[PDB]
């Protein structure tokens, strides 16, 4: 169906330890395909998926120069942001950047992103129209005025509406066996006793791709939620994902609780009950 | 007033010596570049820099080196002068990597094996032909700058102490007087043309000015010849009447 | 090979549409530039382009097609001032901004009343030579040199008396011999 490509950048200053660390990763949907680690020895953009290894040297030389340019830019931001917020030189601080594009089932442009954070808090973000900015605080207004004079939004828009979706369609074609697959979940239910007069009913979903899935619990027909524990979707290590949802029910009210799972690998939302 | 500036504008190096070309910009640009341009191809990237404090290697970094201690400066240093490094060097800057580059004036660099081979030009203004006035009612003044090496010259015409740009064309590149030596002097030609009612006025003064970029004072001149330093050599002519 | 431009020099009549093209190898390039460089001057930017399609700026139109990996520049109403070398620049990632070899453009002027003549000029007596002048030729004629390599001739040279609305080609010849401005020729007169 709909797909996306995103790049995640993390820069951390380490005053009491040494030089800053820079980590960059690229994703197509929930599948990472490239990476760069400033602490690694290669100092190159490295493949992380089989379908990206076919790219020629001009790709790996070009991505490496650009990912180094990102790191060198974040290295300047660390000093600048430390001045913007009157912070000491002895503390460790984090710069994070995320950008990418979404496409629909027709692989055409849907939405572009470019978000920037400092110390885990929003700093400046490109608006949906790809022509204006949202400054989080008053110190970020300086950056907003600087990037508007540099016409940064026009350059990002040309990438998000053009280069981003063009390479995304190329990736989806080169890795059709991997990216365009849909692994159906493998569901089962577990049951244990919490205390007297109480029991646990856990609804499992294993080996499904993509990571998007919804698990809800229901009581003899009605949506009885917000009294339940929902664990976040976790990776299994082989390209698939896992997730579970457990509800607390009386020791005798067991067979009046349904769990409804729906995944794009399932033609119709599944339902299960204990036993 | 914010721009990018190169220095020096011209330089003649003896082979084996080190040299550093200066480049500075006050446009708060993060990325800066160095190129060389020879008369046989286009611009070739020597070194680049994305931000202050970092450098990168271009197409032909061999024999050159750069540093980026701050945002404004980006000096290009030659380790050992080689005649193959004779070229025109352009420094450029962009706001960030990937954006448009703004170029400097450029630096004409010539590496010669010996400084005894530098000579200033000899200027001569040739008066119009008797037939040209009769036939065309025009008068062409041809200027010849001869016997100069290298070709670091800039020719211009001056009428009544003011530089004219109408009716003047100069040869794009100086011509080698002896193409069989590879260290021979050059020649340059230029024409200035006015109406017959202007050359026949005896009041009017014509001067062909040739700016020559040669040696400098710090350079050691130890020879039995007038020093061929940076100078201006000019020849003049006054309009006849009949 | 990384950046290959139109191989010239291209001779374009005055007023004709001058077409320049430029191909690049890196399919991932994201910014492209056209520069104008007069003889002995610095490259001056004409326009930049980031996306596929056309981009217009006066008499200049650039066209980018990432799929074919070409960028082109069309110059309408070629004026005499457009005579220069046009440079194509492509960014290969980071600071790797690479240029092509450049395309020399020569906008030929229209000599309305060609008046060929070979004149002889006497020096001022400050030097001691003698020069010959191939002048007022039709712009179609071209000149070459060097019967006896000890002679010197220049290429054709277009001057413009901008107050008389008049232009003409020019060529100069001189040597050190029993000289004669009559035999200084080799080309079509």
């Amino acid at each position: 169906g709909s797909h996306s490509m995103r790049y995640f950048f993390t820069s951390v200053s380490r005053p009491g330890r040494g030089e800053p660390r820079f980590i960059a990763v690229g994703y197509v949907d929930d599948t990472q395909f490239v990476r760069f680690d400033s602490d690694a020895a290669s100092q190159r953009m490295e493949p992380r998926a089989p379908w990206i290894e076919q790219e020629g040297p001009e790709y790996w030389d070009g991505e490496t120069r650009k990912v180094k340019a990102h790191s060198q830019t974040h290295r300047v931001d660390l000093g600048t942001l430390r001045g913007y917020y009157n912070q000491s030189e002895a503390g460790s601080h984090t710069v994070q950047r995320m950008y990418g594009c979404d496409v629909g089932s027709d692989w055409r442009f849907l939405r572009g992103y470019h978000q920037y954070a400092y110390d885990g808090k929003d700093y400046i973000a490109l608006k949906e129209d790809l022509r204006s900015w949202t400054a989080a605080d008053m110190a970020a207004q300086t950056t907003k005025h600087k990037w508007e004079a540099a016409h940064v939004a026009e350059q990002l828009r040309a990438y998000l509406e053009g280069t981003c979706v063009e390479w995304l369609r190329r990736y989806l074609e080169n890795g059709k066996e991997t990216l365009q697959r849909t692994d159906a979940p493998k569901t089962h239910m577990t049951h244990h006793a919490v205390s007297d007069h109480e029991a646990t009913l856990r609804c499992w979903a294993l080996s499904f791709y993509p990571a998007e899935i919804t698990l809800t619990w229901q009581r003899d027909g009605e949506d009885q939620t917000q009294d339940t524990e929902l664990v976040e979707t976790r990776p299994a290590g082989d390209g698939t994902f896992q997730k579970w949802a457990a509800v607390v029910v009386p020791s005798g009210q067991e067979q009046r609780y349904t769990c409804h799972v729906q995944h794009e690998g399932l033609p119709k939302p599944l339902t299960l009950r204990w036993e | 007033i914010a721009g990018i500036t190169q220095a020096p504008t011209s330089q003649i190096l003896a082979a084996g010596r080190r040299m550093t070309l200066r480049c500075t910009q006050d446009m708060r640009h993060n990325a800066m570049y160095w190129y060389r341009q020879d008369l046989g191809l286009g611009l070739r990237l020597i070194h680049y820099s994305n931000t202050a404090g970092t450098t990168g290697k271009g197409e032909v970094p061999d024999g050159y080196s750069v540093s980026r201690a701050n945002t404004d400066d980006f000096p290009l240093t030659l380790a050992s002068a080689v005649p193959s490094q004779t070229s025109v060097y352009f420094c450029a800057s962009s706001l960030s990597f990937g954006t448009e580059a703004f170029f400097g004036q450029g630096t004409r660099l010539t590496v010669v094996e010996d400084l005894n081979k530098v000579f200033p030009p000899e200027v001569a203004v040739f008066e119009p032909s008797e037939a040209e006035i009769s036939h065309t009612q025009k008068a062409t003044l041809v200027c010849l700058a001869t016997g100069f090496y290298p070709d670091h010259v800039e020719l211009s015409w001056w009428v009544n102490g003011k530089e004219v740009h109408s009716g003047v064309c100069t040869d794009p590149q100086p011509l080698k007087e002896q193409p069989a030596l590879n260290d021979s002097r050059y020649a340059l030609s230029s024409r200035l043309r006015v109406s017959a009612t202007f050359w026949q006025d005896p009041r009017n003064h014509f001067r062909c000015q040739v700016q020559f970029y040669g040696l400098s004072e710090a350079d050691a001149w130890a020879a039995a010849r007038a020093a061929p330093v940076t100078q201006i050599v000019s020849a003049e002519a006054w309009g006849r009447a009949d | 090979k990384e950046v290959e431009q139109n191989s010239g020099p291209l001779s374009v009549p005055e007023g004709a549409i001058a077409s320049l093209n430029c191909t690049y190898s890196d399919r991932g390039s994201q910014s492209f530039f056209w520069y104008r460089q007069y003889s002995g001057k610095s490259p001056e930017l004409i326009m930049f382009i980031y996306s596929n399609g056309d981009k217009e700026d006066g008499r200049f139109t650039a066209q980018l097609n990432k799929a074919s990996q070409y960028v082109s520049l069309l110059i309408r109403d070629s004026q005499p001032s457009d005579s220069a070398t046009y440079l194509c620049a492509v960014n290969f990632g980071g600071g790797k901004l690479i240029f092509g070899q450049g395309t020399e453009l020569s906008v030929k002027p229209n000599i309305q009343n060609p008046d060929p003549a070979v004149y002889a000029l006497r020096d001022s007596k400050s030097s001691d030579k003698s020069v010959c002048l191939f002048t007022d030729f039709d712009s179609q004629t071209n000149v070459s040199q060097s019967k006896d390599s000890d002679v010197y001739i220049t290429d054709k040279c277009v001057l413009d008396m901008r107050s008389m609305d008049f232009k003409s080609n020019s060529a100069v010849a001189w040597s050190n011999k029993d000289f004669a401005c009559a035999n200084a020729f080799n080309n079509s007169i």
């Binding site: 790049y7 960059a24 690229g26 790709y59 070009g62 991505e63 650009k66 990912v67 340019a69 990102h70 830019t73 300047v76 931001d77 600048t80 942001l81 913007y84 950008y99 470019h114 920037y116 700093y123 400046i124 970020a140 950056t143 600087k146 990037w147 540099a150 940064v152 939004a153 350059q155 990002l156 040309a158 990438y159 280069t163 981003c164 390479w167 | 993060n30 931000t51 706001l95 960030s96 990597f97 990937g98 954006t99 | 991932g28 390039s29 994201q30 910014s31 980031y50 960014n91 990632g93 980071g94």
Partner: peptide, 10 residues
Amino acid sequence: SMLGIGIVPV
């Protein structure tokens, strides 16, 4: 393919 333009210091 990551950004080759629009990356400017804050």
